[PDB]
Structures are given as structure tokens and as C-alpha cells.
RNA sequence: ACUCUGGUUUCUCUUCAGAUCGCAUAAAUCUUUCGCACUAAAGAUUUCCGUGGAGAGGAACAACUCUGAGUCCAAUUUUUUGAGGCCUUGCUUUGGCAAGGCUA
């Protein structure tokens, strides 16, 4: 009644390797440490593909969830209990 | 809000705000229209299909959902 | 067709399906106490003798339905033979187990208080009737007699309040749903 | 609240221009309180593209620029409370 | 019901903020609100012209903040 | 220790079957009345 | 042979009369019900076992019916009710309780929404959306109705009864549109083709009719008249069915003979023995030319016609 | 927040029940064991006392509590906007798309 299913799947994706695209086209693949009700994602050990194609290694990242276009989660969470 | 509980597990096409297409199995949604889509293939234009997996699409960037296919077995 | 030959045609069909698919074409009474009192007072042998096989059932059903010492009178449903060969106490002595244990614990209290009070207790002589003395007709000297109080323990209205209205009944709350 | 006027408008063939210029002509089926518009018999022309026939659509309510209602609409009995 | 963004991991840390219009900024975090506006000590601006511009204590609206990178090890 | 569990019956009842016959009738008597009745009837059975 | 199953093989197990027999439209299972208050689900092929049983009728089952989906089974019973069952695990998903007398008929809406037009002995022809749990529209016929059916469009109801006329009711006009007159007694059985243009009619004038229920009106809809049929003192509800290719009609008769005519030739193709009582309903398999027949002899006769 | 089930009691029948069917406990018979069998144990069967469940049938009064079903949010973080306009190429399906640079 209060919290939705996709934020439960986002909380279920913590510890896993998620790849989050942001509003400025930058793709961040790495270990999602923590995520909140708003989609503020503290992630770590991040491989970053910018818009040009350059890849950087940013070891501790906190993305503001407003700017997140989407996150690609592991398909393990296709069997997560809140997706039933 | 049963108008999209009618559409769960249907293979849906989600046109986004940049113009990208998300053809994925519509698993879940919430009040902010954040979608959970599984086995989601991105379609962009020059045509190419880019498999992603379990996409948590934030509701800010979703324009329009439409069904591509019936739910699988 | 016509109108009256479509109303009579419906009346003949309503009285056809109302009885053909009627729900009855789908695919006892007790006795007064006196009737058996007169039968055993005034008393095809086969009937009497096929009855008389089940006498230990009558003994067992009688002794198991004994009135507990907080009951003066226990009326029991009785299945009797029409020849008066056998009377069966038909009921099973069902008691709520906390009520039954509480009633017998009150019996323990009151009987200990009475053996303390009655210093020289006079036990019943046994057998209470002697051998060549016929058993009493219930109607002539027991029927109208009032039994001496039973042994129900006095229950004070303040602490025994949810129990005292029904504590010493036969089947205490049997009519209460 | 004017969105309540739109959810009284079930089974009307309206066009909707979005913020991406895409004109969607179809019979409206459902409206949320956030104007989440669910449509059927959809003829969607994404602009700078040829129009596509699709059987069902569900626009998010934020992304609507405006609606276009037909001539035959009784709104004087629709915007009452 | 606005919960604060979970940033005591990043307090007193050297972070590089990305801001909205392709912009970038560096500095020490000093706190936040539930709206993720960040207060920053030792702020070096670091524009795309390439020369690095120190300011000090600044406040950044949380609307404009794309990402934090903790340059220091948390 | 010697308790074996009770065996699967078909639930026949003796007194319901007696009540189903024309030879038995139902009444409600005092227990001491049917006490005297069972003592007299057993006396009559043993003397027969 | 020209099928998959055995020859004339019999179905025993009904405890009383069988008033209605219907094939599952996939053609691998089977439903038969009657005076038992008890629907039996058989297998069409194999050893023809009875794999499932449906209890939940307090009276005899007048009309069994299947939607083209085949998952849910509609059952107009004698008591006052029409039950809706499922066919796989077999529990009554719904009761429909609005008729005040003996419900003689039901019919599935197969194309659009799942509507169950029913008719009963009070005269009310009631339509039943299953999500409403109530009577949508009650077409008040003054006399008893013994057979009701939808058209292909599911927008008209075609009720045949004891009023000597077949009466069609429009779902949007909510009136009787025209009265197919030409029967001389009570019309007991109506069935409609898979292509939906033609409609069969059985009545106690011992004649079978074919009408053409269609918007194109030829102003006298009694195109084909069939004889051979008889209705007897038992006065059952003698039902009907169409072949899935539309080539053969079958009307249940009172002289124990499974009747199958040709639509074009208007002659009795099949007059089959074996039954002992009045034959209430005779049905057609969807895929193969197989015929089951339900009669008062507490038995069913499956059989390869061709 | 509007509508349709199902009730409860009692009497009886039928079947299943190795489940403390019994929060209690009998008896008979057979076999075995030792004594030398009420004062003794084992195993098994049976009968009784008398249960739970399901199914069915009757008849008494309750009929919508319960078990279900059908039926107040424009100010950062989502849904009341940073949106719109210019330049080069690859192809133009000469409509324009894709990438980047911009300007606001």
C-alpha cells in the first residue's frame, strides 16, 4: 500500500552487479551497495561507459536516483519473491 | 489501478523519452510508473537489438507502453 | 394458436413440470412415562426373548448414567421394550471435563467438611433391602417424594460468579449455544 | 480537479499530442488520477515517422502535451460535480 | 516522508560531483538534507576549460547533482 | 503399553437400531425409576 | 472407421435419465447430464472412462452447454438455478440464481463477453454476465420457454417455448422483433450452427424446422421442414444439434431412434437403434464424424456416423 | 462505502479412519515364554463400551455478524517540465534520421 514492487526489486539488487544508465547517457556497471526508496544508488567497483565510448574505473559511486533512466538488474531477481 | 494489472507478463513495448524502445516482459509497476521488465531487448534507430535482461525502468523516462506479444508459457 | 388454448396449454405444462420435476420425485415419537410404568407394572415369547439377550447393555447403560452426588434426580432418555423386558438408559453420560473435575473437587471439599462435621458417620447397611423383599414400585413411594438436598458446595456470589448459575445442573450449559 | 473530467470520458475516440510530437488517435479506455491514459484501436504517428497501427497503448500521464476531443462532446454535463 | 539520502559513508570525504549541464565539481562533503543538497568544504570548481578553480564552502542544489564519486576511500 | 489403537468400524449403534424397531419405544424416566426397572427386568430374566 | 476411437461403444454410469449431452469443442472430453443432478465428464477417445464428476445441482440438469473456449461448462438445472463450472479440475465457479421456476435452457455467448442467456418455466428469459452476479435483462414471455439460444453475434436471444412460436429478442432494442410462427405445439429444442446463419427447431408437432436467423430477411424464415420425428406422452425437452460442417442436423426423438438428417437432401440419413427410451439430446463431435446420443435409458451411445 | 453464496441445532443412515480414532481403558480367544497363571508377561486376532471425518436423508428456526466473492498529491526524489531554436557529415525512405558541437 506504501512501497512499490520495483523498489523492492531494487533493494533486492543490492550486493549484485547492476548496470545503471543515467540521464546524461553514462552507463555505470558495478556492485550496487545500497539503494533507497528514491533510486539513489550507492554502487562500487564501477565500469563506466560514457557517451563517447570511453570506459573509466570509478571505485565508489553514489548516483542520484532522479537522473537514473533505468537500471539493468541481474536475471536472478526474475525469481525474487516480490516478482511472484 | 487494474488497467496495467491487465498487462502483467505480456511482452510489452515501451517507447522512452529519448526515443529508445524497451521490448520486455512486463513484470511489475508502481505508482511512479517505474517498470520491472524481464528479458528486455532494446530497439533503437539503424536497427539493432540489444539484450539487457531485467530492466528497472524509472517512471520519469517512460512515455508509452504497448503490447508486442502474449505472455509465454 | 389461440389465447385460451395457450393459457390452458401453459396450465397443463405448469402442472406437468411442477410435479414431474417436483423435489419429492428427485432421483419417531416418544412416549409418556406412564406407558412404560404400566407396562412394567402389569408384567409371542420370541419378542421377549430376543429382547432379553441385551440385559448387560441395560446394566452398563444404567450404571454409567448414575446421578452424580450433586444431583437429586437425573431424568434420562430411556429406550424400553414394549413387552417391558429391558429398559435401556439411552444417553451417554457426557460431562464437560473442567466442569466435571470442578464439581468433584467441590465434592471433595464438601465431603471432607461433612466427615469432619459428622463425627459418628452412619454408613448405609448393605444390602439396603433384604433378600426376600420385593423391589419398590417407583410410582408408589419414590415418585412424589422430595429428595434430601444434594451435596452441591455452597458457591459465594462474589468469586464463583461466572459458574454458580449452572455449576450443579445435570448437563450444565446444554441448552446454551 | 480537471483529470476527473477525463475519466468521465470513457469510450471516446480522441487524439493526443505528446511532448515528443507523437499524435495518438484512438478510443480512450482508462484514465488514472495522474492522467495515465490507456487507449485502444490506436493509430499512432510518431513524428518524423510513418504512422503505425497498434491494438492497445498506455501513455504515461506526465508525457501528454494535450488532448483533442471530437465535435460531438457534451462537456456542459461533464464538468459538473 | 522524505528520508535523507544515505550519505554518512561520504561525510568528510573528497568527492567529485557531476552537475547538470555537463558540469563537474570537487570538494569535501559536510552534510545534506533529505533533498540531497550538498554542502562542500574546499570546493575546487574544475571546469571543462581545464584550469582548476578553488572556492571553499559552497552549497549545491540536489536537483542538479547527477553523481557522487568518493575519490577518497570509504 | 498394551494399548492398540481403535479399529476401523462402520459406526453401527445398538440403540439407534433398537429405536428403528417396532419393539422399542422412547421415553424420559427418572434414573432411579429405570434403576428399579433394570433390577426387576434382570430379576425376571434370571428367573425365566 | 474415419475417426480415432472404437465403433458403437456405450457409455454407462448415468444413474437416471440423460437430458443433455454436449461435446467439448476441442473434441477430447465430453459432458453428459440429466436426472441425476450430476454431470459426468467422459473421455471421447481411449477406453471412454469417467474422469470427473460435477455435483452441485439440487435438481435435474436440463441443459448442458460449452463455450468455444471449452474451459467453463454452463448448466441450466431444474431447481431454479444455472451453474457455471470449470472442466479441468471440476468445481462450480458460479451459481446463477434469478429464475423463479424450472430453468429449461441456457446458452453460451462464445464470441464476445461471456453471457449466458437462460429461459425458465416462469416465462422470463434472463441474460447472465458472470461478473455481475445478477440479472442483466429479463425478456418477459407470457408462457413457458423450453429452449433459448444466442445468434452468432451474441446480440439477440432466440427463445423457443410452448407459445407455438419461436421468439427472438434484441439485446439493444429490448423488444421482440419478429415471431417465427408455423409450429403447432411446444418448441422444445433450439440449436444454432457454428457459422451462425441457420437455427434448428424441434417441437411437439413431430416436425423439425430450419430457420435462418440473419439480418438479411427473406420474410418467411421457415426454409426447410423435416419429418420422421415424433413427440410422445412423456413430453420431454427434445433437443437438437448441428454438424460442425453444417451438413447434418440431429433432433432427438421420442421413438428411441437417433435421427440425423441431411440439410440439403432433407432426408433422414441416419435412424439409429440401441436406445430404449425417449432420446432427449443428440450431439456432434467437433472434429471427427462421431455422434453421442442421450436418452432416458440411462445410457449414451457414441458412434462413428461416417 | 452497494449485491450472491454458505448457516446453526437435532434425528438417522452409509462409508472411511493405526489419529491420545479414547489426554480413557475393558473382556474373550489363539500362540509363545517361563513359572508349578486372578494374584504373569509377550505377540496377534476378535468383540464390546464410544469416537472423529466425509457423504446422504429427514425436521427445527435463523437468515447476511462471520468466511469470502461480485463491487485527501503543482515548488529538488518520479505524474503538472529545461522545455525549445542553430551548425557539420553518413545516407536522404529529399520527410528527414544518427553522432557531435552548440544557444537558451
The DSSP string of G186-233 is: -EEEEEE-SS-SEEEEEETTTEEEEEE-SSS--S----EEE-S----T
Residue G242 exposed, middle or buried by CB count within 10 Å (0-12, 13-18, 19+): buried
Taking CA atoms, C108 is separated from B34, C28, C152, C154, in Å, by 74, 42, 11, 13
- Give chain C positions within 8 Å (CB) of G231: none
Query: Considering CB atoms only, which of A5, A23, A69 is closest to B36?
Result: A5
Q: For residues D18 and F20, what is the distance between their CA atoms, to the nearest angstrom? A: 84
Angle at A40 between CA A35 and CA A45, to 5 degrees: 70
Q: Exposed, middle or buried: residue F8 (CB in 10 Å: 0-12, 13-18, 19+)? A: exposed
Instruction: Note whether G156 and G150 are within 8 A (CB).
Output: yes
Residue A8 parent element (H or E): helix A5-12
Task: Please state, as a whole number, how many other Cβ atoms lie within 10 Å of the Cβ of residue G100.
Answer: 11
CB G34 within 8 A of CB G61: yes
Instruction: Tell me if G236 sits within 8 A of G280, measured CB to CB.
Output: yes
Q: Where are the domains of chain B?
A: 1-72
Chain A residue numbers with beta carbons less than 8 Å from the beta carbon of E10 are: 62
Query: Which residue in chain D is spatially nearest to B60 when comparing CA positions?
Result: D62
Q: Is the dihedral of CA D36, D62, E4, E11 positive or negative?
A: positive
Do G128 and G82 touch, CB atoms closer than 8 A?
A: yes
Residue G124 burial (10 A CB sphere; 0-12, 13-18, 19+): buried
Q: Give every strand in the sheet of G176-181, ordered side by side.
A: G145-150, G156-161, G165-170, G176-181
- Whether residue A19 contacts residue A26, with contact meaning beta carbons closer than 8 Å, is answered with no
d(CA C65, CA F28): 13
CATH fold label, A3-84 = SH3 type barrels. (2.30.30)
Residue G9 sits at the chain C interface (C-beta within 8 Å): no
Question: Cell 519473491 maps to which residue?
Answer: A81
Which of B28, B31, B56 lies closest to A71 in CB terms? B56
Beta strands G240-242 and G224-226: pairing type? unpaired
Mark which residues 30-59 of D lie under 8 Å from B by CB: 30, 32, 36, 38, 42, 44, 46, 54-59
Grid cell of G16 as nine digits: 437416471
At which residue does the C-alpha cell 463425627 appear? C119
φ, ψ at A68 (rounded to 5°): -70, 120
E71 CB-side CA count, 13 A: 10
Which of these, G151, G111, G114, lies nearest to G129 by C-alpha position?
Answer: G114
Q: Distance (Å, rounded) from C-alpha C14 to C-alpha C6?
A: 12
CA G237 to chain centre: 10
- Cell readout for G83 is 451453474
Question: CB under 8 Å to C137, separation ≥6 — which residues?
Answer: C41, F36
Q: Which three cell numbers stand for residue G251?
A: 433432433
Resolution, given in Å to one decimal, reads: 3.3
Strands G145-150 and G156-161: antiparallel
Neighbours of E5 (CB within 10 A): 23
| Cα G274 versus chain centre, distance | 21
- Grid cell listed for G106: 441456457
User: Distance (Å, rounded) from C-alpha G85 to C-alpha G79?
Assistant: 17
Q: Which three cell numbers stand for residue G131?
A: 461478473
Q: Do B3 and D29 touch (CB under 8 A)?
A: yes
Q: Would you call C40 and F43 a contact, using CB atoms and an 8 Å cutoff?
A: no
* Max Cα–Cα distance, chain A, nearest Å: 43
Which residue numbers in chain F precede an interruption (C–N > 2.5 Å)?
Answer: none
Question: For residues G231 and G208, what is the distance between their CA atoms, to the nearest angstrom?
Answer: 11
Q: What does the radius of gyration of chain C's CA atoms come to, in whole angstroms?
A: 28
In sequence order, the β-bridge partners of residue D27 are: D13, D40
* Closest nt to residue E33, judged CA to C1': H76
Are the Cβ atoms of B53 and A72 closer than 8 angstroms? yes
DSSP G297: T
User: For residues G261 and G241, what is the distance between their CA atoms, to the nearest angstrom?
Assistant: 11
Q: Which three cell numbers stand for residue C147?
A: 429428595
The Cα G235–Cα G206 span in angstroms is 12
Task: Provide, as residue numbers in chain C, all residues whose Cβ is less than 8 Å from the Cβ of G147.
Answer: none
Can you give the residue range of the structural domain that contains D70?
1-81
Tell me the torsion sign for CA atoms E38, E43, E48, E49. positive
Helix (H/G/I), strand (E/B), else coil: A63: strand
Nine-digit cell string for A63: 548516483
C and G adjacent (3 or more CB pairs under 8 angstroms): yes
Question: CB–CB of F34 and C55 under 8 A?
Answer: no
C25 CA from H27 C1′ (Å): 49
Of C66, C78, C92, whose CA–CA distance to C35 is shortest? C78
In CATH, what is the architecture of G4-305? Answer: 7 Propeller (2.130)
- Please name every residue paired with G118 in a beta bridge, in sequence order, or none if there are none: G126
Whole-angstrom Cα distance, residue G124 to residue C164? 61
Q: Whose grid coordinates read 494489472? A: B5
Contact between G146 and G132 under an 8 Å Cβ cutoff? The reply is no
CA G122 to chain centre: 20
Cβ atoms of residues A43 and A36 within 8 Å: no
- Please tell me the experimental approach by which this structure was elucidated: cryo-EM
Residue C113 to residue C106: CA distance in whole angstroms: 10
Sequence-distant (6+) residues with CB within 8 A of B1 are D32, D36
Q: Do F41 and C78 touch (CB under 8 A)?
A: no
Task: Return the closest-CA partner of residue D36 out of B59, C24, G54.
Answer: B59
For chain G, positions 204-243, list CB contacts with chain C under 8 A.
235
> Where is chain D broken, named by the residue before each break, C–N > 2.5 Å?
none
- How long, in residues, is chain B? 73
Every domain of chain A and the residues it spans: 3-84
How buried is A34 (Cβ within 10 angstroms: 0-12 exposed, 13-18 middle, 19+ buried)?
middle
Judging contacts by C-beta atoms under 8 Å, the chain B residues touching residue A65 are 58
**Residue indicated by cell numbers 429398559:** C87
What are the structural domains, with CATH classification, of chain E?
A: 8-70 (2.30.30.100)
Chains B and A touch (3+ CB pairs under 8 A): yes
The answer to whether residues C106 and C163 touch, using CB atoms and an 8 Å cutoff, is no
Is the distance from CB of A26 to CB of A49 less than 8 angstroms?
yes
**How many angstroms separate the CA atoms of C107 and C115, rounded?**
12
In angstroms, what CA-CA distances link G149 with C12, C128, D15, G100, G125?
Answer: 25, 86, 40, 20, 10
The answer to whether F29 contacts C87, with C-beta atoms less than 8 Å apart, is: yes
Judge whether A64 and E65 are in contact, CB under 8 Å: yes
Q: CA-to-CA distance for G164 and G170, rounded, in angstroms?
A: 20
Sign of the four-CA dihedral G294, G234, G54, G49 = negative
Chain D partners of B19 at a C-beta cutoff of 8 Å? Answer: 20
Best residue in A7, A32, A64 to probe E by mutation, most E CBs within 10 Å? A64
Residue A68 in contact with partner chain B when CB distance is under 8 A = yes
* G295: phi then psi, degrees, rounded to nearest 5: -145, 180
**D35, closest nucleotide (Cα–C1'):** H79
Distance in angstroms (rounded) separating the CA atoms of residues A19 and C157: 76
Name chain B's partners: 3 or more CB pairs within 8 A: A, D
Grid cell of D34 as nine digits: 495522474
The string over D55-73, giving b where at least 16 C-beta atoms fall within 10 Å of a residue's C-beta and e elsewhere, is: ebbbbbebbbeebeeeeee
Q: How far is the C-alpha of E31 from the C-alpha of B49, rounded, in Å?
A: 43
Contact B66 D42 (CB under 8 A): yes
* Cβ neighbours, 10 Å, residue G255: 16
What is the residue-wise DSSP string for C75-130? Answer: EEEEEEETTSS-EEE-S-----HHHHHHHHHHHHHHHHHHHHH-SS--PPPSSSS-
Q: Which nucleotides of chain H are near protein (any atom < 7 Å from a CB)?
A: 3-5, 8-9, 11-22, 24-25, 42-54, 56-57, 69-71, 73, 76-81, 83-84, 95-101, 104
CA-nearest of B7, B1, B3 to B66 is B7
Which segments of G44-89 are extended strands (E)?
Answer: 50-55, 61-66, 72-77, 82-86
CATH number at residue D12: 2.30.30.100
Helix, coil or strand: residue G166: strand
d(CA G51, CA E67): 64
CA G257/CA G274 separation, integer angstroms: 8
Residue in F23, F27, F38 closest to C58 by CB: F38
- Using DSSP's 3-state secondary structure scheme, residue C65 falls into coil
User: Cell numbers at residue C81, please?
Assistant: 421394550
Contact at CB, G144 and C27, closer than 8 angstroms? no
Measured CA to CA in angstroms, residue B26 lies from A84, B10, B51, D63, G108 at distances of 12, 6, 15, 20, 32
Angle between helices F31-47 and C55-64 (to 10 degrees): 160
Query: E32 vs chain A: nearest CA distance in angstroms?
Result: 13
- Neighboring chain B residues of A13 at a CB cutoff of 8 Å: 56
Segments making up each domain of chain G, as ranges: 4-305
Touching chains, F (3+ CB pairs < 8 A):
C
Distance F14 CA to H33 C1' (A): 40
C-alpha pair distances (Å), G2 with each of G22, G273, G303: 21, 21, 11
Cell numbers linked to A59: 571505485
Task: State which H helix or E strand residue G169 sits in.
Answer: strand G165-170
A1 is written with which cell numbers? 500500500
Q: Which of G16, G79, G143 sits opposite C27 (nearest CB)?
A: G16
CA of A59 vs chain B CAs: smallest distance (Å): 23
Question: Look-up: residue for cell 454408613?
Answer: C123
Cis amide bond preceding G261, omega within 30:
no
Chains contacting chain D through 3 or more C-beta pairs under 8 A: B
Amino acid at each position: 500500500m506504501s512501497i512499490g514492487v520495483p523498489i523492492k526489486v531494487l533493494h533486492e539488487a543490492e550486493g549484485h552487479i547492476v548496470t545503471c544508465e543515467t540521464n546524461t547517457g553514462e552507463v555505470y556497471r558495478g556492485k550496487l551497495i545500497e539503494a533507497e526508496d528514491n533510486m539513489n544508488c550507492q554502487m562500487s567497483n564501477i565500469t563506466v561507459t560514457y557517451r563517447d565510448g570511453r570506459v573509466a574505473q570509478l571505485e565508489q559511486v553514489y548516483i542520484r536516483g532522479s537522473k537514473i533512466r533505468f537500471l539493468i538488474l541481474p536475471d536472478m531477481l526474475k525469481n525474487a519473491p516480490m516478482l511472484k | 489501478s487494474s488497467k496495467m494489472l491487465q498487462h502483467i507478463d505480456y511482452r510489452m513495448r515501451c517507447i522512452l523519452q529519448d526515443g529508445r524502445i524497451f521490448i520486455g516482459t512486463f513484470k511489475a509497476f508502481d505508482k511512479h510508473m517505474n517498470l520491472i521488465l524481464c528479458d528486455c531487448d532494446e530497439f533503437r534507430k539503424r536497427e539493432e537489438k540489444r539484450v539487457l535482461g531485467l530492466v528497472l525502468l524509472r517512471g520519469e523516462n517512460l512515455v508509452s507502453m504497448t503490447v508486442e506479444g502474449p505472455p509465454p508459457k | 394458436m389461440s389465447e385460451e388454448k395457450l393459457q390452458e396449454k401453459a396450465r397443463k405444462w405448469q402442472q406437468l413440470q411442477a410435479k414431474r420435476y417436483a423435489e419429492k420425485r428427485k432421483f419417531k415419537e416418544d412416549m409418556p412415562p406412564e406407558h412404560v410404568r404400566k407396562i412394567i407394572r402389569d408384567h409371542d415369547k420370541r419378542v421377549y426373548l430376543g429382547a432379553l439377550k441385551y440385559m448387560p447393555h441395560a446394566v452398563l447403560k444404567l450404571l454409567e448414567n448414575m446421578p452424580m452426588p450433586w444431583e437429586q434426580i437425573r431424568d434420562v432418555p430411556v429406550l424400553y421394550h414394549i413387552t417391558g423386558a429391558i429398559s435401556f438408559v439411552n444417553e451417554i453420560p457426557w460431562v464437560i471435563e473442567p466442569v466435571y473435575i470442578s464439581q468433584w473437587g467441590s465434592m471433595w471439599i464438601m465431603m471432607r467438611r461433612e466427615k469432619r462435621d459428622r463425627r459418628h458417620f452412619k454408613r448405609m447397611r448393605f444390602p439396603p433391602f433384604d433378600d426376600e423383599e420385593p423391589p419398590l414400585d417407583y410410582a408408589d413411594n419414590i415418585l412424589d417424594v422430595e429428595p434430601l438436598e444434594a451435596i452441591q458446595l455452597e458457591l459465594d456470589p462474589e468469586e464463583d460468579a461466572p459458574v454458580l448459575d449452572w455449576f450443579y445442573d445435570h448437563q450444565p450449559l446444554r441448552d446454551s449455544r | 480537479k480537471l483529470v476527473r473530467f477525463l475519466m468521465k470520458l470513457s469510450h471516446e475516440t480522441v487524439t493526443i499530442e505528446l511532448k515528443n510530437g507523437t499524435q495518438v488517435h484512438g478510443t480512450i479506455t482508462g484514465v488514472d488520477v495522474s492522467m495515465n491514459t490507456h487507449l485502444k484501436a490506436v493509430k499512432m504517428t510518431l513524428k518524423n515517422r510513418e504512422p503505425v497501427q497498434l491494438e492497445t497503448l498506455s501513455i504515461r500521464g506526465n508525457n501528454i502535451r494535450y488532448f483533442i476531443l471530437p465535435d460531438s462532446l457534451p462537456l456542459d454535463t461533464l464538468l459538473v460535480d | 516522508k522524505a528520508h535523507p539520502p544515505e550519505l554518512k559513508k561520504f561525510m568528510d570525504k573528497k568527492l567529485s560531483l557531476k552537475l547538470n549541464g555537463g558540469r563537474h565539481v570537487q570538494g569535501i562533503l559536510r552534510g545534506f538534507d533529505p533533498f540531497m543538497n550538498l554542502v562542500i568544504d574546499e570546493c575546487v570548481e574544475m571546469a571543462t576549460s581545464g584550469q582548476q578553480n578553488n572556492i571553499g564552502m559552497v552549497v549545491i542544489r540536489g536537483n542538479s547533482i547527477i553523481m557522487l564519486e568518493a575519490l577518497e576511500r570509504v | 503399553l498394551k494399548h492398540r489403537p481403535p479399529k476401523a468400524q462402520k459406526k453401527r449403534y445398538l440403540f439407534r437400531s433398537f429405536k428403528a424397531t417396532k419393539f422399542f419405544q422412547s421415553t424420559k424416566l427418572d434414573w432411579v425409576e429405570v434403576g428399579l426397572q433394570v433390577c426387576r427386568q434382570g430379576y425376571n430374566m434370571l428367573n425365566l | 472407421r474415419c475417426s480415432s476411437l472404437q465403433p458403437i461403444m456405450l457409455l454407462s454410469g448415468h444413474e437416471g435419465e440423460v437430458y443433455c449431452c454436449k461435446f467439448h469443442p476441442n473434441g477430447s472430453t465430453l459432458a453428459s447430464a440429466g436426472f441425476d443432478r450430476l454431470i459426468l465428464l467422459w473421455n471421447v477417445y481411449g477406453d471412454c472412462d469417467n474422469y470427473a464428476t460435477l455435483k452441485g445441482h439440487s435438481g435435474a440438469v436440463m441443459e448442458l452447454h460449452y463455450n468455444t473456449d471449452g474451459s467453463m461448462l454452463f448448466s441450466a438445472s431444474t431447481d431454479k438455478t444455472v451453474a457455471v463450472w470449470d472442466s479441468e479440475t471440476g468445481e462450480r465457479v458460479k451459481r446463477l440464481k434469478g429464475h423463479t421456476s424450472f430453468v429449461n435452457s441456457c446458452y453460451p455467448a462464445r464470441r464476445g463477453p461471456q453471457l449466458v442467456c437462460t429461459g425458465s418455466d416462469d416465462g422470463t428469459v434472463k441474460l447472465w454476465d458472470i461478473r455481475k452476479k445478477a440479472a442483466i435483462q429479463t425478456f418477459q414471455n407470457t408462457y413457458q420457454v423450453l429452449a433459448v439460444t444466442f445468434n452468432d453475434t451474441s446480440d439477440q436471444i432466440i427463445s423457443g417455448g410452448i407459445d407455438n412460436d419461436i421468439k427472438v429478442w434484441d439485446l439493444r432494442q429490448n423488444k421482440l422483433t419478429y415471431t417465427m410462427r408455423g409450429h403447432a405445439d411446444s418448441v422444445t429444442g433450439l440449436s444454432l450452427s457454428s457459422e451462425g446463419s441457420y437455427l434448428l427447431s424441434n417441437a411437439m408437432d413431430n416436425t423439425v424446422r430450419v430457420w435462418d436467423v440473419r439480418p438479411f430477411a427473406p420474410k418467411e424464415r421457415c426454409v426447410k421442414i423435416f419429418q420422421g420425428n415424433v413427440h410422445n406422452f412423456e413430453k420431454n425437452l427434445l433437443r437438437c444439434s448441428w454438424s460442425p460442417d453444417g451438413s447434418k442436423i440431429a433432433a432427438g426423438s421420442a421413438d428411441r431412434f437417433v435421427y440425423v438428417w441431411d440439410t440439403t437432401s432433407r432426408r433422414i440419413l441416419y435412424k439409429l437403434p440401441g436406445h430404449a427410451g425417449s432420446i432427449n439430446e443428440v450431439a456432434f463431435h467437433p472434429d471427427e464424424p462421431i455422434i453421442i446420443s442421450a436418452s432416458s435409458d440411462k445410457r449414451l451411445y457414441m458412434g462413428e456416423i461416417q
